[PDB]
Write a protein that binds this ligand. Sequence first.
Ligand SMILES: Nc1ncnc2c1ncn2[C@@H]1O[C@H](CSCC[C@H](N)C(=O)O)[C@@H](O)[C@H]1O
Ligand SMILES: Nc1ncnc2c1ncn2[C@@H]1O[C@H](CSCC[C@H](N)C(=O)O)[C@@H](O)[C@H]1O
Ligand SMILES: Oc1ccc(CCNCc2ccc(O)c(O)c2)cc1
Ligand SMILES: [Mg+2]
Ligand SMILES: [Mg+2]
Lengths: 234, 234
Amino acid sequence: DDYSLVHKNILHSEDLLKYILETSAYPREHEQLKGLREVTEKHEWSTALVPADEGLFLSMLLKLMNAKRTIEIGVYTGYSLLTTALALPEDGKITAIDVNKSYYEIGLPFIQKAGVEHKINFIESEALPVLDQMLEEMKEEDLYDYAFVDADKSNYANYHERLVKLVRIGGAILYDNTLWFGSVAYPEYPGLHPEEEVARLSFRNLNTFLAADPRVEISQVSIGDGVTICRRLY
Amino acid sequence: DDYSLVHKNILHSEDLLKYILETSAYPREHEQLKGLREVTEKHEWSTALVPADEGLFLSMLLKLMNAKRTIEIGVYTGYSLLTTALALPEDGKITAIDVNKSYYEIGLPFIQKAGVEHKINFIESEALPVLDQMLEEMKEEDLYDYAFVDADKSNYANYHERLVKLVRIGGAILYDNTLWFGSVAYPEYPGLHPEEEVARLSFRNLNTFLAADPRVEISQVSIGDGVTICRRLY
Ligand SMILES: Nc1ncnc2c1ncn2[C@@H]1O[C@H](CSCC[C@H](N)C(=O)O)[C@@H](O)[C@H]1O
Ligand SMILES: Nc1ncnc2c1ncn2[C@@H]1O[C@H](CSCC[C@H](N)C(=O)O)[C@@H](O)[C@H]1O
Ligand SMILES: Oc1ccc(CCNCc2ccc(O)c(O)c2)cc1
Ligand SMILES: [Mg+2]
Ligand SMILES: [Mg+2]
C-alpha cells in the first residue's frame, strides 16, 4: 500500500463501527451485496469500497424521496450501484459512469443474480465528457432525481457544476468522502501521499464552497467517510 | 458530575466535529435556530440538545421526502421542533409532545420570531397516552409522514409499537441517541448512572429488535449520538 489514511476511522473506535455493521447493516444487507463486498474486500483497492452502513443510508434516501432515475459517478466493483438498483422500483433507470469497466465486471455477476442489471446503463469513460454531452442532450423532462459522486476526488467541484444542471429541482446530489478520513479538519496534515494531500485540500475547498453555494441546501453527514447531501434549489 | 456520558462523542476527535459544525452546519443554521441553541447551551440539561449538524440532516430528510404532517416526541427547548417547522411547507402541521412545557417556553420566543408557531400543536403530556389516544381517532388519510423520537429512552420500544401504525406506509420514524455515546457497543459498560445504564440496555435491545422488524426498513446513521431511520413497509 502507498496511501497513508486507508485504515483511519472517523468514529472513536473500531468496536463502535463493528457494532453498527454487525447489529444494523449486515443483517439488512442483500445477499448479492454481501457477495459483492466479500470479493471486493480481497481486491487491492478495497479501501475505496462504500461501507455497508453507508450503503443502507443511501438506499434509505432513495426510497424516502421515491427516486426513479439516478446517475452514479464512480462505480468500482458496484456496491453502491447495486445498492441503488435494489432500492429503485422495477422500472427505475441508472446511468453508471466509470473509467475502468474491468472493476465493474467483478461485481456484475452479483448484479445480474440480483436481477436488476436491466436498470443499469454502464458507460466506460471519464465522467466529465459524458456529463457535458448529457447537458447538451437533456430535456427538462429527463432530469435525474439523484446523483452519487464517488470518483476522481480532485474533480468533485467540476462534477458539481454539471450536476446542478442535470438533477431536477428538489433532486439530490451526494458527494462521498467529504471528511477524507478526518484529515480535512486541520489546515495541514503530515504523513500523506502526494495525491492524498491533493484530495484533502480539494475536499477542504469543496466543503467551504458547498456551504456558501446558494443553488443548493446541504447536509454533511458523518457516516462512512463523510457524505454531503445537496438538494437543488433552482 | 452526576451522569457519566455527557462529555463523550462518537467521532474520533472533537476537532473533526468542530470542523463539521463550523464549515457546514453553522453557516446554514437559521438565525432563530442559532439563538435557541445558544440559550439552551447555558441550561443545565444542555447535553440533551440535538446538535447542529444532525439538525440540518433532519431538515434535509424532511424536504427530500416532502413531509407535510409530522409528530415530534421529546421537545425540550425545541431545537429539532423549530428545525422541523422551518423545513416544512407553509401549510405543514406538527404534533409536539413533551412532559415539561417549561423547557418549551425557553425556545418558543425563537419559534415565534421565526414565524412558524402556527404549524405547531404542543401537548404537555406523557407521550404514550397521547399516542394511544391517537390510535383510536386516527383516520387512514390522517397518518403522519414523519416521526422524530427523542423522549424517555427506556420507552422507545413502546413508542415504536404505536408509531408503526400512526405513520403512513413509506413514512419515516427516526429514533435519536441509538448509539448512546458509544456505550451500546459492549455488553457490559462500567460506571454509568443507573438511568444511563437502563437507557443503554434499552438501546441495545431496540437496535437488535429494529434490525429484525419486518414492518420497517432501517438505517442506523452515526450522526450526532446515532439516529436510526425507519421506513414503514406495511
Ligand atoms: N475521471 C473519472 N471518471 C469516471 N470514473 C473515474 C474517474 N476517475 C476515477 N474513476 C473511478 O471512480 C471509482 C472510485 S471508487 C468508487 C466506489 C464505489 N462508489 C463503491 O460503491 O464502492 C474508481 O472505480 C475509478 O475507476
Ligand atoms: N414520557 C415522556 N413523554 C414525553 N416527553 C418526555 C417523556 N419523558 C421525557 N420527555 C422529554 O423528552 C425530552 C428529551 S431531550 C429532547 C431534545 C430535543 N429533541 C432537542 O431538539 O433538543 C425532554 O425534554 C423531556 O422533558
Ligand atoms: O433519564 C436520563 C437519561 C440519560 C441521562 C444522561 C444523558 N443525557 C440525556 C440525553 C443526552 C442526549 C440526548 O440527545 C438526549 O435526548 C438526552 C440523564 C437522564
Ligand atoms: Mg468513496
Ligand atoms: Mg436526543
